[PDB]
């Protein structure tokens, strides 16, 4: 109500007289009438190679906090309030996605109500591309990370009241593992990498490094009840299995697309695992982009993502997740994913595939079983 | 089309040509350029555009994309420039005006013609354009609310590629002088959108000259069934004068239908699809309430994506799906793709849709 009843009686209007989304590249002077906040150069993205975006939720929820203090300022009580950017079309395309992705998640905006200022801004915001190192051929666009955020709240799968920035952002940083949990069913991230930091001699001292041990701790304290390795082999997997943790291999070629039957194999995985209350930690060489795939393919058959939704959603989390042409994959199977709900059911018979949980199987045979 | 040069093979090893603002989608033969002034040709390169000849004619704030008798008409010219003997040792520059409206209907015009003639799949025509700056303005509707939805090159390529896929495109028998008579609004304003269906503007009556044209050519195009989607402008007798079923069901201007309607309409369709018969729906324009009703046939049908729907539906005839309608094909999109395998259609035909069979769950289908 300091955002709906009050305000002042480049630039994009979002709420009249109140919030507004600007482009300088320069430091407009604020006035009586007007506040202006740039969050740049203290919450940016940090690119692995030419992605760009966009923002993550702890970037948002950093935002929101600094969007709340200038709304609540008594000095602010009659001021429009102008978020901007700088004027390139990756940084406006930054700050407009975060700034729907706040009306989305905290103001509880629909997604024609946050997409309707953006529409035909000439000069057009730049589409988010993926993180890989071949040439772009794939975009999502701010529509899309809109509707997947929007999607994954209504979902019960993002929930700002309830997030913990601290173990969020501590968790991100290589030294700690490398890994985000994306939902309350999934965990993504990068391989552990064993070593020996402490060398060969040292008889009383675990050889495991710090993020291998930070990993192995927080899944035993948060219910990771399965951890599939989807590339080669750089570290043994009786750390996780020693730990109570069930360890299944489901390893494809580094930035390559799983054929079926692993996505098959892992959908069925994943269900025994989620009937049991349990959490799915899934990783990859990076944990972005063969996780990416599987991660997705089971959030599209549980949940209804569109393709480009579910990617944005997903490096809304993680960013970088579904790597070149994976995403065209993922959207060229998306119907398959979505419509095994109707044509496979979970079989009543364990398979030594996925190491004695239920895979995924066809209509006919549920029927004779 | 006259033949031309093969652009799906291998081809010849040819040097790559460098010029500021203009992408490269085949190293040393095609370029797509954006100026404010008319390049010279050189000996190395030829330039042209279509903008002087091939006009999108807006309804109200809505650019493009161009459709497919523009595609039609620009493969010609492009083929004409191509098999010049004079250009044999040269790059073919297609350009168009600096703004990124102009820039984006150039961009999917030749993408489409890329997917259409070259059979290039989506990724190979999206590579070139991807995270080019400044962006190309994404394509938005043609109502006269603002601008709430845009759909993408992408997903206009990916449409039309799907289209094509599935049998719906076939410019081996596109006939554009039947294309553009058509689409005038004294001959009718319609469009055969795809081998079951037909988007018409409503005829009005007080015969004038479009409706006898309409008339005419649905007697002679195998059309069984007409849908009218909006208040009556006319007698309704005239089609069942001349053997086609004539069938209600209206909903209110520039809103979306109840999915009772729609399932009511796609078991409608699939009778008359089933008997080898066109179906051909009117609401006022034949672009909103129409474009509800195909689109979720199209999608139930053929799995294309919602953006993917509307940009197809939008390549044969701009304007399709107006407003909100679009967020709305958009979240009931799997709706359409789940009845495929919770209904069937019914044994027991339905007053509601003039005798026609209706969908029906499993579960009353068991019964039957």
């Given at each position: 109500?300091?955002?709906?009843?009050?305000?002042?009686?480049?630039?994009?209007?979002?709420?009249?007289?109140?919030?507004?989304?600007?482009?300088?590249?320069?430091?407009?002077?604020?006035?009586?009438?007007?506040?202006?906040?740039?969050?740049?150069?203290?919450?940016?993205?940090?690119?692995?190679?030419?992605?760009?975006?966009?923002?993550?939720?702890?970037?948002?929820?950093?935002?929101?906090?600094?969007?709340?203090?200038?709304?609540?300022?008594?000095?602010?009580?009659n001021?429009?309030?102008?978020?901007?950017?700088?004027?390139?079309?990756?940084?406006?395309?930054?700050?407009?996605?975060?700034?729907?992705?706040?009306?989305?998640?905290?103001?509880?905006?629909?997604?024609?109500?946050?997409?309707?200022?953006?529409?035909?801004?000439?000069?057009?915001?730049?589409?988010?591309?993926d993180?890989?190192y071949s040439?772009?051929?794939?975009?999502?666009?701010?529509?899309?990370?809109?509707?997947?955020?929007?999607?994954?709240?209504?979902?019960?799968?993002?929930?700002?009241?309830?997030?913990?920035?601290?173990?969020?952002?501590?968790?991100?940083?290589?030294?700690?593992?490398?890994?985000?949990?994306?939902?309350?069913?999934?965990?993504?991230?990068?391989?552990?990498?064993?070593?020996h930091?402490?060398?060969?001699?040292?008889?009383?001292?675990?050889?495991?490094?710090?993020?291998?041990?930070?990993?192995?701790?927080?899944?035993?304290?948060?219910?990771?009840?399965?951890?599939?390795?989807?590339?080669?082999?750089?570290?043994?997997?009786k750390?996780?299995?020693?730990?109570?943790?069930?360890?299944l291999?489901?390893?494809?070629?580094?930035?390559?697309?799983?054929?079926?039957?692993?996505?098959?194999?892992?959908?069925?995985?994943?269900?025994?695992?989620?009937?049991?209350?349990?959490?799915?930690?899934?990783?990859?060489?990076?944990?972005?982009?063969?996780?990416?795939?599987?991660?997705?393919?089971?959030?599209?058959?549980?949940?209804?993502?569109?393709?480009?939704?579910?990617?944005?959603?997903?490096?809304?989390?993680?960013?970088?997740?579904?790597?070149?042409?994976?995403?065209?994959?993922?959207?060229?199977?998306?119907?398959?994913?979505?419509?095994?709900?109707?044509?496979?059911?979970?079989?009543?018979?364990?398979?030594?595939?996925?190491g004695?949980?239920?895979?995924?199987?066809?209509?006919?045979?549920?029927?004779?079983?």
């Open positions: 109500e300091n955002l709906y009843f009050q305000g002042s009686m480049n630039t994009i209007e979002f709420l009249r007289g109140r919030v507004y989304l600007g482009a300088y590249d320069y430091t407009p002077e604020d006035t009586d009438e007007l506040v202006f906040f740039t969050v740049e150069d203290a919450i940016f993205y940090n690119s692995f190679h030419l992605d760009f975006g966009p923002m993550n939720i702890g970037h948002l929820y950093r935002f929101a906090v600094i969007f709340h203090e200038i709304l609540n300022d008594p000095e602010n009580a001021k429009a309030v102008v978020f901007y950017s700088s004027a390139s079309t990756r940084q406006r395309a930054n700050a407009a996605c975060m700034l729907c992705c706040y009306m989305i998640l905290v103001q509880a905006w629909t997604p024609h109500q946050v997409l309707q200022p953006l529409a035909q801004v000439d000069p057009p915001f730049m589409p988010f591309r993180a890989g040439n772009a051929d794939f975009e999502i666009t701010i529509q899309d990370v809109v509707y997947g955020v929007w999607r994954a709240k209504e979902k019960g799968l993002i929930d700002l009241h309830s997030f913990n920035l601290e173990s969020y952002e501590k968790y991100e940083h290589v030294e700690f593992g490398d890994f985000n949990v994306l939902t309350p069913d999934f965990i993504a991230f990068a391989s552990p990498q064993e070593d930091p402490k060398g060969y001699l040292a008889t009383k001292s675990s050889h495991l490094n710090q993020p291998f041990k930070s990993v192995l701790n927080f899944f035993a304290n948060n219910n990771v009840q399965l951890v599939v390795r989807l590339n080669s082999h750089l570290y043994n997997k750390h996780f299995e020693d730990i109570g943790i069930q360890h291999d489901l390893i494809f070629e580094d930035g390559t697309c799983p054929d079926l039957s692993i996505v098959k194999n892992f959908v069925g995985a994943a269900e025994t695992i989620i009937k049991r209350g349990g959490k799915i930690a899934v990783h990859c060489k990076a944990g972005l982009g063969r996780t990416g795939c599987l991660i997705g393919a089971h959030l599209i058959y549980t949940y209804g993502f569109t393709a480009n939704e579910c990617i944005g959603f997903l490096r809304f989390i993680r960013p970088g997740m579904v790597v070149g042409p994976q995403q065209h994959w993922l959207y060229l199977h998306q119907n398959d994913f979505r419509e095994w709900k109707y044509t496979t059911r979970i079989s009543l018979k364990p398979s030594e595939a996925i004695g949980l239920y895979p995924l199987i066809s209509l006919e045979e549920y029927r004779l079983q």
